[PDB]
Amino acid sequence: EAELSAQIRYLTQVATGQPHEGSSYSSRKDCQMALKRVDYARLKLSDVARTCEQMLEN
Amino acid sequence: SEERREIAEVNKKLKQKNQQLKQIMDQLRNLIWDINAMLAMRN
């Protein structure tokens, strides 16, 4: 009973009844952009690799 | 007399090799152009 009563008092000092409109969306978009930029790079590199591979072989 | 005959193959082969290099070069330059354009405005 001691612990629950203390917890209720703590909630009575931290409650305000508003939705708290912070968030973390922008940095997550930026990081996703960077990952797909790296993927583009990896695709083009593989293509160059295969054309050089086929020229070296005759 | 046969020298001409033999020379031609090396010219054609070399020309073919040059053509192949052209495809690789235009491809690499397009890749670098794309990465420049995409990276220029990441800010």
Torsion B25-B30-B32-B33 (CA) sign = positive
Count of all residues that appear for chain A in the document:
58
- Cβ within 8 Å, pair A48-B39: no
- Nominal resolution in Å? 3.7
Q: How far is CA B35 from CA A18, A30, B1, B31, in A?
A: 45, 17, 53, 6
- Cβ within 8 Å, pair B35-A41: yes
End-to-end Cα, chain A, rounded Å: 85
Q: How far is CA B8 from CA A28, A29, A57, A58, in A?
A: 61, 58, 21, 18
Best CA proximity match to B29, nearest among B41, B17, B21, B18: B21
Task: Count Cβ atoms within 10 A of the Cβ of residue B38 and give its class: 0-12 exposed, 13-18 middle, 19 or more buried.
Answer: middle
Question: ∠B34-B39-B43 over CA atoms, to 5°?
Answer: 150
Q: Give B-chain residues touching A37 at CB under 8 angstroms.
A: 38-39, 42
Alpha helix segments (H runs only) across B1-43 = 2-40
Please name the member of B24, B34, B39 whose beta carbon is closest to the beta carbon of A48.
B24
- Nearest-angstrom CA–CA distance, B21 and B11: 15
Q: Solved by what technique?
A: cryo-EM
